[PDB]
Each structure stands twice: as C-alpha cells, then as structure tokens.
C-alpha cells in the first residue's frame, strides 16, 4: 500500500519513464515501475497507470532480490485498506480485502508493507523475524 | 558437586523466581503442559567449542531437554541448531558508562573512541563477560574491538558493576534490559546509559525448542495474545523500575 | 476526556485500520471504538491534511511515522506516552520455502549495519 514515509509513488515524466533524482549524499534514488489505480472507485473509474515507486520498503525489497536470484512484478491494492474480515452484508459470508484479500485470492505471492503483527492475521499466514520497533 | 576430585554430586532443591519464570507459569495456565524445572551445571548458555556445544544449547539439541525459557539471544549459530517462538520483549545491546560524576560521550559504536583508545588523551577500557554471547558480534563485526577488549577483560557482572562504580573500569558493553534494570535501582545514579537501542542490534528473547517441534504453533499463539491483551504490560511494571 | 469524548476532542484513525481492531479487543475500550467510526477517514494523509486545518484534535498512527513527519514540519506535534510495543513484519503466503531465508536474511541485515543505512536514507534525516 501507499505508505508515507516508506513508499513514494511518482507518476512517469514523458512515457514509462522515472526521473533518476538523486539524493544529497551521492546514492542513486532507486525506484520501481508499479502499476495500480489512479484514485478510489468512486473518483477514479477505472485509471491504472505504471507509475514509479521507491521508497524505503523498495530499498529493503531491492535489497532481497539482490540476496537471493528471483524476479518480481508489483502491483497495487485496489484500495487503501490492509483488510478486514467481514462477513457479506446479507449473506454474513466472512471474507477479506485489501492486502490480505489479494494475498489469500492467490493474487499475490508476498506482502511487503508496514504490516501491523497481530494474532488475529498471523492464523492466517506466517511472518518473518521483526525488521521494525515501534 | 561436593569436591574437585571427584565428580559425585549433590541434587539439592531450592526455589526459583523472576520475571521469565512469571512467562512460564502462565504458559501453563493456557496450554496446559507439564515440567521439571532444573539449572544447568555444564554452565553458561552456549558456546560452541569445536563444533561441541554447552549449556542449554549443549541440553536441548542433544535433546536431553525440551525448551529453555531463560532469557537467550537470537543469532545466525544458535538458530541453525533449534528454533525461536515469537519475541516478547524489544532488547538491544549497549554500553555503560558513569557518565554521572559527584554530552556527545559515547555517540555509538561508530565514536572515535572505539578507533584507537590512544586517539584521546585518558587510556579508556572496556570488557564484557568473557565466554558471553555478545562477544561473539565483537568478533564478527569487529575483530580489532576484539583485540583491545583482550586487555579490557572482567569476570563478573557486578564485578564490572564495581568497578564502574570504584572506577576500576571507563566503560562496558551488556545486554540493554538488564542493564537498565540494575540502572533504575541503583543509589547514587552515578552510572548512565547510553542511547535506547539505536545503533545496535534492536533483537527480541525467545524460547529454544528442539528443531520442528509440534508445540510452536501453539506456543506463538499465546504469547502473541498474552501481549495483545496488556498482561505482559503489568509484568514489565513487576519486575521493571524507571525512575525520572 | 478521552475516556468519556465529545465534540471537542476530534480523534479518530484510518478506517478498517489494525488499531480499530486492537481497540476492538479492549472490551473496556468500546466507547472510542464508538467514537472514532463517525470520523474515520479513508488514508491517513486525510488526518494530516485535516489536524493541519485545526480540524482534528487526536490521531493515533505509527510512532516513527509521525517523528519523520514532525521532522519535516515544524507544527507537527506528538504526544509522550509509547503504547503497543510490537513490531512490522513481511506478510507471507502460507508455509513455503520462501520463509526460511527470508528470515535468515532479515536477522543478517538486522545483525549488521545496513538498517542503519536505510535509516540513514529516510528515517534518520531531519529538516
């Protein structure tokens, strides 16, 4: 998801392009070309663009697929919530959104976000050591 | 044991409390287990010497034990010979140093300090407990650390704490809870701490189990639970004290 | 007053958020938890963008976020309390071997100093 400080997400300049900033200490800002919707359903009808995205969770990500040899493809949630169980309104069928429901929909393969560790979600899927404190 | 000579031994019984042994009580309470609380005399937690380890380590992958619940660190060698539960409690490692007497001080590990004690002026020192776990990230980040921490050695956790407190010693090197514990109830207040984790390990304690044990799955779920519900926040008041 | 709110104190948090959970479970914290369901808000840079109005009174959010953003501006303020002591971590399929060395490399990067260059890169600096 859009996370302030974590993920930035940049719309491309001309076509497909992201603009090589760098940062006042000599690093390469190092982005990815992500694709997801331009605003809500309500605002945005249907716009999904390849903007591009980098960040601090982009780093740490990066800094996996620099360990270990496989590819990625990103993507964005549809919406702006990490997920939530909630039974259908008539049918009161129990089900999941946002982050979590792409994930359990076989959608996506891996989360990596500010994901907020809880018993409630870990009965669902399994966790890594902590790379946060707060 | 009674004598040197000889390795005949006694299995006194006395009692043990605390603030992990609180953890394992309620353990109890949820999972409903049983358990035989006894002390290790091969001695401190693990090291491995020669590919031969001791201690816990020494007592749970040779599976003469199950799980330990005393407080353990969590590092490369020690995990590919068990397996960790969940963590509880947010601790690092840091360095103490009387920096109360009658600023920048030590900005971190990365201070000048830590280049060549003969950079300043007064011929500084600093130990840690010798055979300890910490010594090992000494090595492995920093094998000159280690080098000028061969003449800085001490023997005892208090020992150092002495000579702190007598200036038998400039600086030292431990765990981050249990030197704030020993800081919060200390007269005087002549030693300080330094920084809140924040250039150092920032790791959690956990539980060894012996490798793939059915019991994790279990284990997780009430710890996660047992700090989702503010139970773990009152035992922190019990056996924690931060004073100003 | 948080405990009994009114109309003065506007606190609320992202809706359908971990933390609306978490209050959930505090069975002795129903009353914010039917506080905060008129005034949650879709993001969270709806809450900055509406406290930075004087809108809003109270917003609970993530502890190195909020310092980050008080670092850039000046007029963001927190509180002094530090709550719910747990941490972040990498939301995974089920069990799979993209597990066992996701988190040995996770603890190889904690044990060494590159966390402290991304903190460096975006949670260290300051304005």
């Known amino acids: ?134 | 044991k009674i004598n040197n000579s000889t390795n005949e031994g006694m299995n006194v019984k006395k009692c043990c409390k605390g603030f992990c042994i609180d953890i394992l009580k309620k353990l109890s309470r949820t999972v409903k287990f049983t358990y035989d609380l006894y002390l290790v005399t091969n001695g401190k937690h693990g090291k491995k010497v020669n590919n031969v380890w001791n201690g816990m380590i020494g007592e749970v992958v040779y599976q003469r034990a199950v799980m330990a619940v005393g407080s353990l660190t969590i590092n490369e060698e020690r995990s590919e010979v068990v397996d960790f539960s969940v963590p509880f409690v947010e601790t690092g490692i840091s360095v103490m140093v009387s920096r109360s007497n009658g600023v920048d001080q030590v900005t971190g590990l990365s201070d000048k300090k830590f280049q060549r004690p003969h950079d300043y002026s007064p011929p500084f020192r600093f130990g840690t407990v010798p055979n300890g776990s910490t010594e090992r990230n000494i090595r492995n980040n920093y094998p000159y650390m280690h080098q000028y921490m061969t003449k800085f050695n001490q023997r005892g956790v208090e020992d150092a704490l002495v000579s702190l407190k007598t200036g038998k010693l400039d600086a030292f090197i431990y765990d981050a809870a249990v030197l704030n514990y020993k800081a919060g109830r200390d007269e005087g207040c002549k030693l300080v701490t330094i920084g809140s984790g924040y250039i150092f390990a920032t790791t959690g304690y956990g539980i060894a189990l012996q490798k793939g044990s059915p019991w994790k799955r279990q284990i997780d779920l009430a710890l996660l639970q047992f700090v989702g519900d503010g139970e773990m926040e009152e035992l922190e008041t019990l056996w924690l004290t931060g004073i100003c | ?127």
């Open chain 1, 1 to 134: 998801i859009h996370q302030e400080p974590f993920v930035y997400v940049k719309p491309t300049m001309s076509d497909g392009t992201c603009k090589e900033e760098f940062t006042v200490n000599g690093d390469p800002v190092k982005k990815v070309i992500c694709t997801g919707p331009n605003d809500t359903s309500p605002g945005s009808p249907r716009h999904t663009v390849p903007q591009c995205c980098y960040g601090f969770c982009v780093d740490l990500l990066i800094k996996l697929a620099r360990t270990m040899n496989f590819t990625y493809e990103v993507h964005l949630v549809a919406d702006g919530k990490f997920g939530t169980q909630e039974r259908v309104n008539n049918s009161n069928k129990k089900e999941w959104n946002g982050m979590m429901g792409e994930l359990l929909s076989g959608q996506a393969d891996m989360i990596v976000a500010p994901l907020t560790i809880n018993n409630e979600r870990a009965q669902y899927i399994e966790f890594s050591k902590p790379f946060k404190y707060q």
């Open chain 3, 1 to 127: 007053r948080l405990r009994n709110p009114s109309d003065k104190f506007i606190y609320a948090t992202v809706k359908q958020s971990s933390v609306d959970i978490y209050f959930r479970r505090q069975v002795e914290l129903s009353t914010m938890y039917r506080h905060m369901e008129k005034h949650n808000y879709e993001s969270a840079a709806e809450a900055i963008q509406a406290v930075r109005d004087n809108k809003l009174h109270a917003f609970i959010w993530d502890s190195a976020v909020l310092e980050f953003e008080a670092s850039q501006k000046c007029d963001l303020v927190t509180t002094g309390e530090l709550f719910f002591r747990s941490g972040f971590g990498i939301g995974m399929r089920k069990d799979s071997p993209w597990k066992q060395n996701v988190s040995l490399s996770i603890l190889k990067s904690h044990e060494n100093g590159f966390m402290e260059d991304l903190d460096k890169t975006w949670v260290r600096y300051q304005e």
